[PDB]
Ligand binder design. Structure first.
Ligand SMILES: *[C@@H]1O[C@H](CO[C@@H]2O[C@@H](C)[C@@H](O)[C@@H](O)[C@@H]2O)[C@@H](O[C@@H]2O[C@H](CO)[C@@H](O[C@@H]3O[C@H](CO)[C@@H](O)[C@H](O[C@H]4O[C@H](CO)[C@@H](O)[C@H](O)[C@@H]4O)[C@@H]3O)[C@H](O)[C@H]2NC(C)=O)[C@H](O[C@@H]2O[C@@H](C)[C@@H](O)[C@@H](O)[C@@H]2O)[C@H]1NC(C)=O
Ligand SMILES: CCCCCCCC/C=C\CCCCCCCC(=O)O[C@@H](COC(=O)CCCCCCCCCCCCCCCCC)COP(=O)([O-])OCC[N+](C)(C)C
Ligand SMILES: *[C@@H]1O[C@H](CO)[C@@H](O)[C@H](O)[C@H]1NC(C)=O
Lengths: 275, 97
């Protein structure tokens, strides 16, 4: 019943190709909605929305930016130097999310790290926990973070103090946009013929906001058990697109309808008849 | 671990011949992140814009590629994806239907 996003995350993608070539890509997100970009060369933030700074002062935003810029430079150097120690082999990808999340009531925070596309570590409550699969390399990394107490303290501050404050400020700042209701456009088509005498009936639903939606093939009142729920896919304008498909006999397609439920529609679902 | 890209192609609005619209190509579930995504008009490249790189809860990457197009009964549109896990560039055609 709470509308729009409930979490903020910094996101890091770091590619290590060889001893002399490494790339960082950074960004900031409210659930799956990008509100910050990051220019890697200069270490410059990009404020994608009028309310991207939430309730933070310019000086506080600038300090945080300076901090992230230094982090990328240091992170890169440290990994490069410890390639042998951690027996990493080129090419390799490190991924990191860090941020916090509302839970109906105390805000939860953590940093999660991945290596080779797999859970590597998570850092919470001034504690490093290596992922169960991470091995000695994981335990070694956590041991290492305790040699880096300054960096560890900065991160814990960011997680426990700064982030909860930022998340609450930014949900309020972007409230109008984050809780707007946008009605879906819906349409039906028939997809590639799947076999003799059968139709692929496709219900397309696009342009709705927020994300939760329920789309279902019906015959009168009975939900059709063959209904295939496609994955939510993004559009470029903070709405989503969904395909819901039904593989049905040709002489049975008559009387079917697609029922679209969405918060923007109140109790009145959109209905689309096949003929 | 290496994972092949999944590709879906779709229009922003209900397609209607001769009516300006947007074509979306969503490429996801892949690893590593290096990738080449091009939308195509009759097998040729049109100008598109590409979202910043991101990833899902399971660490797999995704990108949204999108461009202005005007559909009509004559022209074919597709999305072409180059990735280390693909022997040859994979083409997924816009199936309006
Ligand atoms: C950005 O917003 C943050 C989130 O605030 C909430 O959401 C915003 C949108 C707005 O609705 C606020 O009213 C909400 O609180 C701010 O952080 C919160 O600040 C408030 C203070 O305003 C904190 O609260 C206090 O908690 C104290 C801890 O014990 C209490 O002593 C205190 O209670 C007293 O005051 C209230 C009156 O408000 C009385 O009812 C009580 O009787 C009692 O006298 C407050 O309840 C809250 O903890 C903060 N929330 C979080 C998650 O950190 C933030 O404000 C800044 O940061 C905080 C930590 C303080 O240093 C503030 O002075 C400071 O301005 C904003 N951040 C920025 C940069 O502006
Ligand atoms: C608002 C815009 C959004 C931008 C997007 C940002 C994206 C960032 C994303 C995530 C990062 C979240 C935390 C950032 C906190 C800042 C850190 C900091 O304190 O910042 C530190 C970082 O240095 C480091 O040494 C980085 C530590 C990384 C250690 C990694 C080594 C491990 C190697 C082994 C590899 C194994 C696999 C690894 C798994 C991955 C696990 C991570 C330095 O400072 P500072 O005081 O000089 O400062 C002063 C400011 N100026 C200098 C600019 C003036
Ligand atoms: C590293 O990668 C770059 C291209 O990304 C290449 O030019 C260079 O020769 C490579 N090798 C070394 C040893 O730096």
């Amino acid at each position: 019943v709470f509308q729009g996003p409930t979490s903020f995350h910094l996101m890091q993608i770091s590619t290590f190709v060889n001893s002399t070539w490494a790339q960082n890509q950074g960004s900031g997100w409210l659930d799956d909605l990008q509100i910050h970009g990051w220019e890697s060369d200069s270490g410059t933030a990009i404020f994608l929305k009028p309310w991207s700074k939430g309730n933070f002062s310019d000086d506080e935003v600038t300090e945080l930016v300076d901090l992230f810029r230094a982090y990328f430079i240091g992170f890169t150097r440290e990994v490069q130097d410890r390639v042998n120690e951690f027996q990493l082999e080129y090419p390799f990808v490190i991924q990191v999310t860090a941020g916090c999340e509302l839970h109906s009531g105390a805000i939860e925070s953590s940093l999660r790290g991945a290596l080779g596309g797999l859970d590597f570590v998570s850092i919470q409550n001034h504690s490093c926990v290596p992922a169960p699969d991470s091995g000695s390399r994981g335990q070694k990394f956590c041991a290492l973070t305790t040699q880096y107490q300054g960096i560890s303290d900065i991160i814990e501050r960011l997680l426990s103090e700064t982030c909860p404050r930022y998340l609450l400020g930014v949900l309020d700042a972007g409230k109008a946009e984050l809780q707007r209701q946008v009605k879906p456009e819906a349409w039906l088509s028939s997809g590639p013929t799947p076999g003799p005498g059968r139709l692929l009936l496709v219900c397309h639903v696009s342009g709705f906001y927020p994300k939760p939606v329920r789309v279902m093939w019906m015959r009168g009142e009975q939900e059709q058990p063959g209904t295939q729920q496609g994955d939510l896919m993004p559009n470029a304008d903070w709405t989503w697109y969904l395909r819901v498909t039904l593989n049905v006999a040709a002489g049975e397609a008559a009387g079917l309808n697609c029922r679209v439920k969405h918060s923007s529609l109140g109790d009145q679902d959109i209905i689309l008849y096949w003929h | 671990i290496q994972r092949p890209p999944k590709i879906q192609v779709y229009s922003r609005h209900p397609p209607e011949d001769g009516k300006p619209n947007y074509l979306n190509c969503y490429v996801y579930g892949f690893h590593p992140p290096q990738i080449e995504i091009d939308l195509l008009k009759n097998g040729e490249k049109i100008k598109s814009e590409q979202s910043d790189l991101s990833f899902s809860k399971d660490w797999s990457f995704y990108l949204l590629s999108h461009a202005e197009f005007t559909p009509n009964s004559k022209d074919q549109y597709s999305c072409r994806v180059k990735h280390v896990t693909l022997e040859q560039p994979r083409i997924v055609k816009w199936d309006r239907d």
